[PDB]
């Protein structure tokens, strides 16, 4: 079963291809409507795979150097194996001398196609956490932020290093635990500083005066964090506080750059408002002028966007080149400037959290999900990931889309047509989780092979290598398009095409390209008589693709207006990282119905699903909404009123960015969210699509 | 939205208490002493003067004047509440010794309460007549 | 008395046994009794020459030496609603005006008649006319701003060398002991800055567990890191500043900072004090080497180098002028063990009415003499009265013109000394000339007025008025000469001659002053004939030439010479004379010819001895009053009674090598010597330490460097000096 094949391959190898049967000819590779693309999750969790504590056993060829995988032909008599990528025949290492047929290594069994190795050679480096704290916020917001940071300090490993940087008008780099004086280095938030300059101005396991181990400093830091008061500078009437977010981040990046380069570090920046001073400014200090909106940026009424975006773009590349992660936790009623700072968490593996106030259950719970541990009490986060992809000689890599940076490595697996962060066989991911999903786009130029090698730093300090080797059948020449049409993953291809549309919208019409490919897909894989719209049908393999495209082109990912620029950057941020299942929920929110006439059942996202005697539970990935009809808007009536609430609580935990909860009913103001995601309309959208699919190609 | 506060006896214009911080002050301090000389027992008890980018605010109680200067953008609603806090404190502590002193600034030590009250109004995160001053001078 | 002529070659013992008293001007009895106290105000020529030609004939300098803020035993404070001042030259109504119509007074400086207002009423019996020294309460127009609060900012060098000297411990202990004794009322503000390669501010808040050390590392672009709690209220935050003064000496014990950024640190300290002004105390221990205002190392001279001074940069001069404009005065405490270019560093205090303090080779363990000296000089520096944002004007009758000022100030408008601070231990000098012949008057007057804000927030005016007669005879000018005052004014002129020209020209002009004046006296009358008023003139000038300010063949170093010149430009006349020509007494045989009037104390009065080794004795002990110190020298063959009954020792060998003071034993010999010592230090507010260390072999016999009458390998004796003058007088 093709569905069982797709399900089992995602659970084992953490990947979902747009096509599971690839074009065996050049004539069909060029004419592919949806490109051969993979939805790859390098750190997907699974039923307790045995960690391999020996060396990976690579191929003995300079260019190839692939990892031993089940696709390799072995010869247990002569103690030799043949590399499946370059046909090179290799000798087994001495630790494999006692190899036998009735006792073979793990990496050769097809069950262990995806597998993780441990490299224990060098002394493990400790984790590094740098707190970058804004102090221009209300007391109740700053006190809650302080309590949240003190709790995160109690979850850190004893070996980890910590630093503290607070800012407002000035920038303070705190020297931790310096006896009874508590000192800090003050810097102007007016001019930017390079790492070298910062190094000259500032100065067994390693530790600086500014980055000390948790087990020896946790008591002084929790007292410092407890005494952190708001920025002492007065804020005059009608003015915004002077906030130097651009310089504070450039000092945090500059600090770690000259102390611990090329090692796992997390710059967690907490923002209570926009940057009003320095490089990286978003808006002026006059309250008379509002923060820029989409209407302001289209009519060229935002003098700080491009100059501010470029500043944080350089900081993003500086930290990504060094190998550090940049987190941004923004909470304010006004906008914050995420549109200008988005490249710091996007290029690295940084998280992006957006709320209304640090003094809410929304931020507090979300912030402690960051430090969620697994079955061994270790953070579900990796550092300094290096993704290298080995392909068959017939495959070339167009590029990747998602949280990663190109290492600019050249080879015969690099394609001329580059897509996204492309033109390379290697990518750096400074931060990855069990969720981080890259979108790899391939191009053909049985059985074709693709190997994913991911080297990252575990939260324990161990260096791990995650090898995943997949194989898909080459098309039969006497049944080319027929087998290709049956191996189509309509869900994965929809998200892989959504990945392309958003990457072009965020780096600029996009909807015109999204329609020409939907019409092209209807003509090549659909059934229809020419000039007869009523004859158009779609296989069960393709039938849901037009609906996934109707919701994608109307979602907030491409219709940026009616949202703030910081909200459009936040929505696109999480979509470019999530796996398949969560990405489908973003584009097409799930909707359950609750009534006396039957148990809860999923219903369509149409206006007809909104009944008066029924309770709805719409699950947008970003918000969970419970809607009550006009009749229910008043023990049996208790089971109905709390059935969606109970189902809400369960999914209101596992999700890392805790979605905003909304309890509304008919006539309520908050019912607007349900009415805009629901429902020109799909009926008209399909009829217009059929008229173009049955007529000219 | 900045600072200049002076407390003077209305009769002879004798200064009683003031407070000034710069890091000009030389011109607006003269105009302040000009007004203290002009004020008499027929002057309006509460008034506001315009001086271009600056704006004076004063009240008069018990023959004592409480003047404050700030930029014109500073709320005139808050300027009078600032002078009211100073008046009630000054009258409660020195209201009966004012008509007897003769030294200039016989209450310099009122500098402390002026500056601690001054900071409770020049910070948004802590929460009558109008005539051009060039006419009265 | 004496109109007689003295032959300096035959006497050779002209120095009196009792202290020198200032001359009495040749004035009428009723006028002299109202004259100003000679300790506050005095003139080099008590008889002013009528013309400039007569002054040039005498070849003596005409000038005034004043100590305007000296501590007084009694001061009349007039609180008049009106200050009676002359309508022309603004001279204050003084005892030497000329009342005629009893309602109109003639100004004694510009001769204009002024109307005596009603408030004044027997107008002449009013205190403003019965006191030459008086303090007024300045009205409203006598101030540019509300009276500023007392602001004290202490700036400490904390480099590796500074930590090794250990000065921070005793200075912080002095502040703790003298916190309540600082001048000021509840408006007093205090701040703290430490520096090395970076400037360190200290915030003090009652809501925080402990102070916060805010470090600005941008050396080329300094700023203030916090707006509120850097200069804190001492009355409210007393507990907070006491912890920091206990915590400061413990922070830098393991410091590797070898460089010091004094320049940028003083800019940070200036920006912090700019809004209010006040007193800035700077403690530097080494050469400034990092940042703006850096100074290059110099090689110290030796006894062989010739007389071949001036600052190397103008940064500390430009910065001092900026401090003066913001009513900020900078007092420099130099505790350096090596050359630190005090010639350039001193400008921070000269052009800001500050005062420099020098403690060479200070060390908390190795140099107990400098430790106790700093402790006592800080006890005075922190508890003496002070005036803020001050100005002073020196006036004189028409015809006399002041043309050169001497002292720590900034001269804004000829006759308008700006005093960011005014301290009671500062001295000032002025040089004048007769621009218009004084044929009209027979009396000329001088008035100094000192506007200042007291530590209690009260604008006050202190006024001194001097009156002198005018003569027209060469002999009358010599009869009124003040040998001490002439010596002080010449020392100030010689310091300027050093910077202006060289040390040789400064020494020559000093010798030529004695030659020209005595040659002029001889040309208007065999041996060296001098009048009675100048019998000590070659003595005090030779002592001037052997002082550490102008000596040559000595092994002196640069910072010692500059600091000695800084004391010439800033000390009152008495302490300048005590430093140059110390008073030498014999103290191993005191007896009952003393001042036993003081109730229960006797207080011997031993005769003053001339500064020659010939006057010493290996059988006795000699105390030398050098003004700021009291060096007690003990002979090798000293008697056994002085050893056990005064020093507490059984033999000369067991006299401890560094002795910080005498013991107070139960012997009448100790009671005599302690009474004489205590009476000496009661004649001054600057407690002088007394070290008996002067043994006959302690390697610290600089007691002999003050024997200015004896010859050395590179200087003439006193008799050799008189022989050289006579050769030049009648050449
Ligand atoms: Zn190979
Ligand atoms: Zn006059």
Residue numbers in the entry:
A (entry chain A): 3 to 205, 223 to 464, 475 to 537, 541 to 666, 679 to 723, 747 to 764
B (entry chain C): 1 to 23, 29 to 132, 148 to 157
C (entry chain B): 346 to 466, 476 to 662, 666 to 882, 888 to 1093
Task: Provide the authors' original text about this structure.
The packaging of cargo transmembrane proteins into COPII-coated vesicles entails a direct interaction between COPII protein and cytoplasmically-oriented ER export signals. About a half dozen export signals have been identified to date, almost all comprising short peptide motifs, all of them binding to the Sec24 subunit of the COPII inner coat. The ΦC export signal was identified in studies of p24-family and ERGIC-53 proteins, and comprises a C-terminal signature of a pair of hydrophobic residues or a single terminal valine residue. The ΦC motif contacts a site on Sec24a that is also the binding site for the LxxLE- and DxE-class export motifs.
A series of ΦC-signal peptides was synthesized, based on a core sequence of yeast Emp24p, and individual peptides were soaked at high concentrations into two crystal forms of human COPII protein: one comprising Sec23a/Sec24a•Sec22b, the other Sec24c. For all ΦC sequences, we observed clear evidence for peptide binding to a site on Sec24a in the Sec23a/Sec24a•Sec22b crystals, based on the presence of residual electron density that matches the peptide sequence (this binding site is occluded in the Sec24c crystals). (E) Conformation of a ΦC peptide containing the terminal Phe-Phe motif of ERGIC-53 bound to Sec24a (drawn as a surface representation). Thus, specific recognition of the ΦC motif involves the terminal carboxylate group bonding to Arg750 and Arg752 of Sec24a, with the penultimate hydrophobic residue of the motif nestling against Tyr496, and the terminal hydrophobic residue fitting to a pocket of hydrophobic side chains. A subtle change of the bonding geometry is observed for the Phe-Phe motif of ERGIC-53, in which the larger terminal side chain of phenylalanine is accommodated by a shift of the carboxylate group to bond Arg750 in a bidentate fashion. This detail has relevance to the binding mode of 4-PBA. Difference Fourier maps calculated from X-ray diffraction data show clear evidence for binding of 4-PBA to the B site of Sec24a. 4-PBA closely mimics the terminal phenylalanine side chain and carboxylate group of the Phe-Phe motif of ERGIC-53 (compare Figure 1E and I).
